[PDB]
Design a protein around this ligand. Structure first.
Ligand SMILES: NC(=O)C1=CN([C@@H]2O[C@H](COP(=O)(O)OP(=O)(O)OC[C@H]3O[C@@H](n4cnc5c(N)ncnc54)[C@H](OP(=O)(O)O)[C@@H]3O)[C@@H](O)[C@H]2O)C=CC1
Lengths: 145, 990, 96, 49, 97, 97
């Protein structure tokens, strides 16, 4: 925990993150625990759900944040869920045994569509609506049977 | 028997020694039992069970990270304003502004300045509102950057109101008082008094009220006290004859202090307080919030230490804990003298000795238990235990504090004791020993002068008036209005807390140091004559009205129905896939830069189109609901019930025709509305991080771990029959140390292990890791459709992978994976997911079960490979001939898989890739993580009072190891160009 | 109880408080229960309570003053509860 | 001793039954003693006597 | 490892009490935890040690040898040693071959 | 060591678990010789592990994540794996040979 906070803080400080703009930290293992290899996948699923909902879950077991972590000014540690007005990108970091460090950046999907024309967007939207109606039908039939 | 007796006599061995000793021990038991039985018949069971100890130093919980909670509280308020949940006419804005100001520092000010300055007020009225409010708050927190925090209560004062409906329904509510809208007006009203005792921008512009908060606001309120009138709140003075009487000057001091508090707020910085009896819904709880607001260091006790209470106290500190304040929560039983001594020792001991190293400035002993309907003839064990709690152990705690300060030579830092006193001593009756305890508490006013502890403790008796709310005075709220009709004042718990905190002001502290103070907070109730009869009359008149109205209405309804002879809809669960919301092209274009159109090669943009998981909280949907909201909706509850096998779907004859959910064990029908009430407790009890269940891990019980030890045989064993092949294997192993001989009439062989041979005796070991994040109990790959043959063939991890892959394709709207081959070649669907350890169950099978010669499938080796899960995915669902690269990255496996998949698509080897991670939990891996000390010791967690739901606490002061879990997670990634062409949902950009 | 100040209140002070307050209340309750179980409502027992003028004035007497002061709630219990036909309260403040 | 063991096995007599029961009783004694010791540390010897 | 004599163990139920054997208190308590009523442990008063007596009906494991039919392998030359290349003893004792 | 030797209560180093991981060899290479902070991607491909490693390394350099890569493969021979390959009949029976 200390090393990860220090790493994120150094990342933000070197790239000129604005002062007063701490990154909000999410810690989903408070609720699920640590699967030794599914961890990154679970965090990525959560990051996608955060990106599409705008909701940042709080660490409900964050009863008292370690005083040592106050030094990392680019990190904020919430204990309660915050419903924001929008998240635009999420950072996912992992640290496996054997010097296996990894990072992924997920950006909100609506930044993709600014790169295409209106007609392509409308065609895609109609195609996805049709696919969702059929996926709903398959999901419920498969669930009950 | 006679031969054996002769042999025993020759061996000089007594055969009855054990029975002799046993009979002596049985007699000692009966003696001790008789002593215990006499003590229980003397003290009673309530007292004997009540004196049980509850305090320990390892269970103490500290809360002092207000530097983080300030920024949380600011972000929460900022987004509540932007979403319209909070508006300018609310006092919540003022209170939260006060709490934020109480924790003001430089980093908080830069945090505010960024978030406010980057607010675009042209996005809406709420945005402009938040900008204005935030700039004002920034100014205020700059103004108080170096000022001490203050306790300032800005809540609307409320009064009692009891109403009776037409049908005789009694409803009690707290309604805003008419003539009092602020605490300053409340102090004015108390100072005036009443005939019986005769011997701002609030709610209109919160932003304006916030601008006023730093401004320290010319006639006192003691001047406005009428002559020949006793104020509702006043102090008393003892006369040479020894009776306490109202004193104008002391009462003026107290009321002036209360006014100054109501206007400017009072600080409690550098005050060390011990408070007992401050649980939710009590007067002490409101006292504790005010102490925390003012910056005090408080240790609060609890007789119901639990995760709920610790979470209640965290929430209170994170809302009110000012800068420099600390909250210590400890388990405590005030009815135990050993607990009292231990608590005071913990408080005074040095930190190097495991204590807090504090010296108390105030003691607020409000712990009490209720005695209802116990008259004189009923005073028994429980009344004795309550009298102990409320008189004798408060005296003992005072003595302990004195002894601690005297052993350290502290003669100039006395602790102020706020004694909860009662105006009534035997007036109502049926309260056990309550009145005796409260009246005996009054000898201290004289003990302070007659004995030698006055330099260590000062006495401050508070006569608490009629307080509405919980504790002991609840149940009387329906007659509060009737009582107040006589010119008397009843108080809310906030009001009484404000009055009590008025006694901790610097001037009252000095007054207590001069001599014992007696504050009367009875609101004039003492002037009402025959209070018992008056209150009984009020209550009787209310019940009479209610019952008469109800019965008359019932009779009228029956007569109408005999003389003359809506349909509501219940919800049904409708589970949604939750594809991303697509917005109109205009809005979507307003987000990204206009230059982006045509700028990007969309075949080099990777997008996630579907994801899924199998974990301790079910699917991605249920896990998200628990992660975000802490509770399941109707859809989430129904899905969890289906996953765990509590409910199943039925369609047909059940004699009537039924279509819907039924109980899986009893086949009884179940409605979606009743699913929560039937199954939510079981669902929560068997999900997430919990005690390990041996039924889910082949009988593994961490409390009895099986091992074997090698022992050399000291003497030949008894022959045992075995088959010829087995006998020859034994002979091959042992050689000369075993004898095998064919039984001529059976063809079998006798095996005789001789002296000096080697055996193994099982021995059990207790392991200290007992909790794990386990997939919900009842989960079964058959519920998803995986057949029995596959389940019996593959490792348990492969089932998690298969289900996650299927659910991730469903989340991408792809119900038939072969539909991908309508757009891409079979060589263009990759699989780049992996695990850290793979099929560890097959590893157990080949390394231990084969060693013990237990039946293991002949191809168990292949089921263990880390790439076998991907092989099975391709062999059952995908059928592609695209790239397969299985990463192994321990705990970073999933991120490594994502990286490999992105590079595989960008190199042109694939256009669609399966990425993700998986791993299981089993005995051997748990043990080895225990030997590395990477995981948390659960016995140490229990020593600190921690339950399994609070053992995983990242970034906390007391974090001590990880919690192991199991499951899988899968994502479908492809090129943005193909995602758009296919029409699949896009959840984000990698 | 001699030379037992506030910090010295211990087993012996608790036992004395039991004797001098709690078991006198219990004995009064026992007498009430015995007269009520027999329907005696017109032959009350007079309870001569040994009371003290001083409650914490001299000090160093353990729980003596608490016991003697608590004895005074009976003057009000007699009216608030239902044993007044079986027992009458007669507090005597014994002098030096 | 081995002859006596053979005879006891033939007689179906357990030679350690008494010691087993004695050890159970000794544990019950310590439990009851611990309860009594807690009550004496809570009430004190003057009150308990 | 000798492919011609592969070691396995077989579970057998004890048909008659075994001869007591001395063990430390911790080991005796582990045996008692495993076997429960099927074992008797008694402290030897003069040593502080414990006698363990496995009774009838308890479970044991007797090693038995098996002959495997794969006896040849492509093996790194005999005499090969990471010390010849310079790898130190501590690393050799720490890591997998 | 962790599945059989610990079961028999024989002395096994307390960190034997880490020595078993397939990425631990690369970790030791980096910790003793290389000391780089570049990409580490450990493939698992049964008998095609080395070719998969070459493919991953080529794509890692071509993506710009690295300019030098260590690629290759390794595996050991031991009793349990030999037996299990015998039970699958993947290896040659030496007695028939
Ligand atoms: N109108 C009024 O309310 C008046 C009150 N008072 C007195 O002032 C005080 C105010 O308390 P109030 O909130 O009204 O009463 P409550 O009964 O609500 O407060 C007592 C609290 O003490 C805690 N407690 C109970 N037993 C024990 C124990 N054995 N050890 C430790 N803690 C225990 C309980 O909380 P938890 O289990 O959460 O720790 C309980 O809620 C009381 O002493 C009361 O007698 C006097 C006159 C009038």
């Amino acid at each position: 925990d200390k090393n990860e906070s220090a790493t994120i803080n150094e990342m933000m400080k070197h790239l000129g993150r604005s002062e007063g703009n701490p990154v909000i930290g999410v810690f989903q293992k408070f609720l699920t625990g640590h699967p030794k290899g599914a961890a990154g996948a679970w965090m990525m699923n959560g990051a996608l759900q955060i990106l599409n909902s705008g909701i940042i879950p709080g660490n409900r077991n964050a009863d008292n944040v370690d005083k040592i972590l106050e030094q990392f000014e680019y990190v904020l540690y919430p204990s309660k869920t915050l419903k924001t007005d929008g998240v635009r990108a999420v950072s996912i970091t992992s640290f496996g045994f054997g010097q296996k460090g990894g990072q992924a950046i997920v950006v909100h999907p609506d930044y993709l569509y600014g790169a295409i024309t209106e007609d392509r967007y409308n065609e895609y939207v109609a195609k996805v609506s049709a696919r969702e109606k059929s996926a709903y039908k398959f999901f419920h039939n498969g669930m009950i049977y | 028997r006679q031969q054996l007796q002769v042999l025993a006599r020759y061996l000089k061995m007594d055969l009855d020694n054990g029975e002799r000793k046993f009979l002596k021990e049985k007699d000692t038991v009966a003696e001790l039992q008789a002593q215990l039985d006499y003590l229980n018949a003397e003290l009673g069971e309530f007292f004997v069970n009540g004196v049980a100890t509850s305090f320990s130093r390892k269970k103490a919980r500290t809360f002092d990270s207000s530097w983080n909670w300030a920024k949380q509280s600011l972000l929460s308020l900022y987004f509540e304003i932007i979403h319209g949940v909070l508006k300018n006419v609310d006092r919540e804005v003022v209170s939260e502004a006060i709490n934020i100001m109480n924790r003001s520092n430089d980093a908080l000010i830069k945090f505010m300045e960024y978030h406010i300055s980057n607010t675009d007020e042209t996005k809406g009225e709420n945005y402009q509102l938040v900008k204005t409010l935030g700039e004002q708050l920034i100014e205020n927190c700059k103004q108080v950057l170096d000022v001490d925090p203050v306790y300032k209560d800005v809540a609307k004062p409320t009064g009692p109101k009891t109403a009776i409906d037409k049908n005789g329904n009694i409803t009690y509510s707290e309604e805003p008082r008419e003539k009092v809208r602020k605490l300053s007006q409340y102090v004015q009203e108390m100072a005036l008094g009443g005939p019986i005792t005769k011997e701002d921008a609030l709610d209109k512009d919160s932003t304006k009220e916030v601008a006023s908060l730093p401004n320290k606001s010319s006639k006192t309120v003691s001047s406005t006290i009428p002559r020949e009138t006793i104020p509702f709140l006043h102090l008393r003075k003892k006369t040479p004859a020894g009776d306490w009487k109202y004193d104008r000057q002391l009462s003026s001091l107290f009321l002036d202090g209360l006014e100054k508090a109501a206007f400017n707020g009072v600080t409690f910085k550098d005050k060390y307080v011990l408070i007992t009896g401050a649980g939710k819904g009590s007067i002490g709880a409101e006292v504790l919030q005010g102490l925390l607001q003012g910056g005090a260091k408080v240790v609060v006790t609890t007789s119901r230490f639990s995760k709920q209470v610790t979470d209640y106290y965290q929430s209170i500190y994170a809302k009110y804990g000012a800068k420099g304040s600390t909250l210590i929560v400890v388990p405590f039983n005030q009815g135990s003298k050993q607990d009292v001594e231990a608590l005071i020792e913990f408080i005074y001991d040095t930190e190097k000795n495991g204590g807090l190293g504090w010296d108390l400035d105030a003691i607020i002993p409000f712990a009490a238990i209720p005695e209802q309907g116990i008259e004189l003839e009923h005073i028994d064990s429980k009344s004795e235990f309550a009298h102990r709690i409320m008189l004798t152990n408060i005296l003992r705690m005072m003595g302990c504090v004195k002894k601690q300060k005297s052993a350290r030579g502290i003669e100039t830092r006395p602790a102020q004791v706020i004694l909860p006193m009662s105006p009534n001593h035997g007036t109502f009756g049926g309260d056990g020993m309550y009145s005796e305890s409260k009246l005996s508490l009054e000898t201290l006013f004289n003990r302070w002068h007659s004995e030698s502890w006055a330099n260590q403790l000062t006495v401050c008796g508070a006569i608490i008036g009629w307080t509405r709310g919980t504790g002991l005075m609840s149940a009387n709220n329906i007659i509060a209005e009737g009582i107040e009709k006589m010119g008397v004042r009843t108080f809310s718990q906030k009001e009484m807390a404000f009055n009590l905190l008025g006694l901790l002001t610097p001037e009252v502290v000095e007054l207590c140091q001069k001599s014992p103070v007696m504050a009367d907070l009875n609101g004039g109730l003492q002037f009402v004559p025959e209070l018992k009869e008056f209150t009984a009359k009020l209550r009787k008149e209310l019940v009479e009205t209610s019952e008469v109205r109800k019965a008359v209405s019932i009779e009228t309804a029956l007569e109408h129905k005999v003389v003359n002879g809506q349909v509501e809809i219940q919800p049904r669960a409708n589970i949604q896939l939750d594809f991303p919301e697509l917005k109109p092209y205009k809005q979507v274009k307003q987000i990204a830069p206009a230059e982006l159109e045509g700028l990007l090669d969309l075949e080099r943009v990777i997008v996630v189109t579907g994801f899924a998981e199998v974990g301790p909280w079910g699917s991605a949907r249920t896990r998200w609901e628990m992660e975000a909201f802490g509770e399941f909706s109707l859809e989430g509850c129904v899905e969890m019930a289906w996953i765990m096998g509590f409910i199943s779907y039925h369609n047909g004859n059940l004699g009537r025709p039924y279509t819907g959910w039924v109980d899986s064990k009893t086949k009884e029908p179940v409605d979606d509305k009743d699913v929560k009430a039937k199954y939510e407790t079981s669902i929560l009890e068997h999900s997430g991080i919990r005690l390990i269940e041996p039924e889910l891990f082949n009988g593994y019980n961490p409390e009895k771990k099986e091992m074997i030890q090698e022992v050399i045989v000291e003497e030949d064993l008894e022959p045992f029959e075995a088959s010829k092949e087995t006998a020859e294997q034994f002979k091959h192993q042992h050689g000369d140390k075993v004898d095998i001989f064919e039984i001529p009439e059976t063809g079998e062989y006798s095996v005789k292990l001789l002296k000096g041979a080697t055996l193994y005796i099982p021995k059990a070991l207790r392991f200290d890791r007992l909790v794990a994040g386990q997939i919900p109990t009842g989960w079964n790959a058959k519920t998803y459709g995986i057949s029995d043959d596959i389940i019996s063939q593959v490792d348990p991890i492969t089932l998690f992978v298969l289900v996650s892959v299927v659910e991730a394709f469903i989340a991408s709207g792809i119900t038939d994976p072969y539909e991908m081959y309508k757009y891409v070649h079979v060589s263009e669907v990759g699989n780049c997911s992996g695990s850290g350890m793979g099929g560890v169950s097959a590893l157990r099978g080949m390394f231990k079960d084969r060693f013990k010669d237990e039946p293991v499938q002949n191809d168990i080796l292949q089921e263990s490979f880390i790439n076998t899960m991907s092989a099975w995915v391709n062999m059952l669902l995908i059928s592609s001939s695209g790239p397969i690269k299985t990463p192994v990255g321990a705990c970073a496996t999933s991120v490594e898989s994502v990286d490999i998949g992105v590079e595989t698509i960008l190199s042109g080897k694939a256009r669609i890739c399966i990425v993700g991670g998986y791993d299981d939990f089993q005995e051997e891996g748990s043990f080895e993580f225990g030997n590395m000390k990477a995981t948390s010791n659960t016995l140490e967690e229990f020593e600190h009072g921690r339950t399994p739901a609070e053992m995983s606490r990242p970034a906390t002061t007391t974090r001590n190891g990880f919690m192991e879990a199991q499951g899988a997670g899968i994502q479908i990634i492809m090129q943005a160009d193909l995602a758009l062409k296919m029409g699949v949902p896009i959840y984000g950009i990698v």
